[PDB]
Design a protein around this ligand. Sequence first.
Ligand code: HEC
Length: 92
Amino acid sequence: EFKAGSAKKGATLFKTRCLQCHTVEKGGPHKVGPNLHGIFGRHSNVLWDENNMSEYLTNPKKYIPGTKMAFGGLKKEKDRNDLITYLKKATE
Ligand code: HEC
């Protein structure tokens, strides 16, 4: 169900909802979460592709309720396709 979307809107969604814990650049520093470079091909066993990550990123995960250490989810379909379109181009 993933359809190539907007990398522009995806890049904005990354700085707002992912950058806080993750980095995309080659040889990026491990932050609260791992470096997502080369994520599409890598596993944990979960062979990362666009559709299985769209499912993964749909649900929010509160690590420390009360602080900004929590992922907010991507409940809108457009937002997931946008973020993945960006992320796919930026993690290689
Ligand atoms: C901190 C509050 C996080 C935010 C915001 C996002 N992620 Fe996350 N992510 C985080 C941690 C602590 C972990 C480790 C494993 C766990 O489930 O706890 C992850 C892991 C990922 C992964 C898996 C990477 C891998 O197994 O190599 C992906 C693909 C991932 N996170 C993507 C991702 C995206 C796209 C986010 C924003 C939309 C995002 N994460 C935010 C912590 C946090």
